From a paper:
Here we focus on OgpA from A. muciniphila, a recently discovered O-glycopeptidase that exclusively hydrolyzes the peptide bond N-terminal to serine or threonine residues substituted with an O-glycan. OgpAWT comprises two domains from the N- to the C-terminus: (i) a catalytic domain (residues 25–262) followed by (ii) a β-sandwich domain (residues 263-385). Interestingly, a Zn2+ atom coordinates with the side chains of three histidine residues, H205, H209, and H215, a highly conserved triad among metalloproteases. A glutamate residue, E206, is well-positioned to act as a general base/acid during catalysis.
The crystal structure of full-length OgpA in its unliganded form was solved using zinc single-wavelength anomalous dispersion (Zn-SAD). The high quality of the electron density maps allowed the trace of residues 27–380 (OgpAWT1) and 25 to 382 (OgpAWT2). The overall protein scaffold and the conformation of the OgpAWT1 and OgpAWT2 were essentially preserved (root mean square deviation, r.m.s.d., of 0.37 Å for 350 residues). However, the connecting loop α4–α5 (loop 9; residues 227–246) is unstructured in OgpAWT2 whereas in OgpAWT1 displays a short α-helix. Furthermore, we were unable to fully model the β7–β8 connecting loop (loop 12; residues 309–320) on OgpAWT2 crystal structure because it is disordered. A close inspection of the two crystal structures revealed that the protein crystallized as a monomer. The first β-sheet of the antiparallel β-sandwich domain consists of four β-strands with topology β6–β7–β8–β11, whereas the second β-sheet comprises four β-strands with topology β13–β12–β9–β10, with an overall size of 39 × 28 × 19 Å (“Methods” section). Both domains are separated by a long and open groove that runs parallel to the protein surface where the active site is located.
Numbering used by the authors: 25 to 312, 317 to 382
């Protein structure tokens, strides 16, 4: 019988989505499933869905998370896929993830009813050899890759260890926190660093480039991350909206970036055949990669003006004389385009388009 783990007693009802993240449990031809994976992974995926949804709600989007196909209460409809080759054919290195994704493309072409969006989370059991095992999982792809994400499973991959000061709890923050961040990449998120103010109130940005924090110390999603998720296919509540087709078409004009005291003033105009959902601004140190501090403003029109004032004291962690400001325009179909501008703190020069 299904029971709800204590970590899921506090949970919000989520909006029904038009597209769902596919969950594939990917087994080499010689690979057995890790026991109880249906329960363990359902619990972990539903808790992760709550994290994303509560953060979207906190940022004003309502109770919107990535969609999941639910088989029964507390149980995600996980596709168990038995692969054509042994697990050694799909390693972390040397294109293992690409080979697995290609094979799943064929599976979904043969069984299109099982595909619910362009986004897939592929989970593979750990290898068990002289390097990896239940106490040191690994061997398998573990990264975002395009719209897909690869993560791993092992016996103690179980929400009951969340936040426990134990060997298994530490393992969970590494591999579940890892899954949370890598899934972010699969959901179109780049890296970004919290602002000074957000760091003090909410902790560490999920998509920061440092060590995984999820489940161990306060972790949150930035406004810029949530603006991208707003335009992510598996967060859609609008069946008529198509995602990722074509090219990102945004005309940006009369761009001006000026510096006055501790304020950075960014302005210009935009025009697109699509609704432009939002502007994200990233301020980043070289090399051109360390985490950029991000900011976001809603737009919501096909044409208009944009204006953002950024306080330099929010730029926590930046320490280079050279810095780059990137303007990212996010479109309703989930594509985006960026423009970049480079400056030096010891020789600040206001920018204006020619
Ligand atoms: Zn990353």
């Amino acid at each position: 019988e299904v029971t709800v783990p204590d970590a899921l007693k506090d949970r919000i009802a989520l909006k029904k989505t038009a597209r769902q993240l596919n969950i594939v449990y990917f087994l080499g031809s010689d690979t057995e499933p890790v026991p109880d994976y249906e329960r363990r992974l359902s619990e972990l995926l539903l808790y992760l869905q709550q994290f994303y949804g509560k953060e979207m709600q906190r940022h004003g989007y309502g109770a919107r998370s990535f969609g999941l196909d639910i088989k029964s209460p507390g149980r995600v409809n996980i596709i168990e896929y038995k692969a054509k080759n042994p697990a050694a054919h799909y390693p972390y290195e040397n294109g293992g993830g690409w080979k697995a994704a290609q094979e799943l493309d064929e599976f979904f072409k043969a069984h299109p009813d099982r595909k619910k969006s362009q986004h897939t989370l592929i989970i593979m059991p750990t290898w068990n050899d002289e390097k990896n095992g239940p106490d040191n999982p690994g061997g398998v792809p573990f990264y975002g890759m395009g719209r897909n994400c690869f993560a791993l499973d092992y016996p103690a991959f179980d929400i009951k260890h969340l936040g426990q000061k134990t060997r298994e709890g530490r393992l969970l923050t590494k591999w579940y926190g890892g899954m949370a961040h890598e899934l972010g990449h699969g959901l179109n998120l780049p890296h970004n660093h919290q602002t000074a103010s957000d760091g003090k109130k909410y902790g560490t940005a999920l998509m920061g480039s440092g060590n995984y924090t999820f489940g161990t110390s306060p972790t949150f999603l930035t406004p810029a991350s949530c603006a991208l998720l707003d335009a992510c296919e598996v967060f859609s509540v609008t069946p008529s909206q198509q995602f990722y087709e074509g090219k990102p078409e945004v005309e940006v004009g009369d761009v001006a970036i000026s510096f006055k005291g501790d304020q950075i003033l960014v302005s210009g105009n935009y025009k697109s055949p699509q609704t432009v959902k939002a502007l994200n601004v990233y301020i980043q140190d070289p090399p051109y990669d360390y985490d950029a501090v991000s900011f976001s403003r809603r737009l919501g029109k096909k044409s208009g003006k944009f204006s953002m004032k950024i306080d330099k004291k929010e730029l926590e962690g930046l320490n280079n004389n050279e810095f780059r400001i990137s303007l990212m325009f996010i479109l309703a179909n989930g594509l985006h385009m960026q423009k970049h501008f480079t400056f030096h703190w010891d020789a600040l020069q206001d920018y204006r388009d020619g």
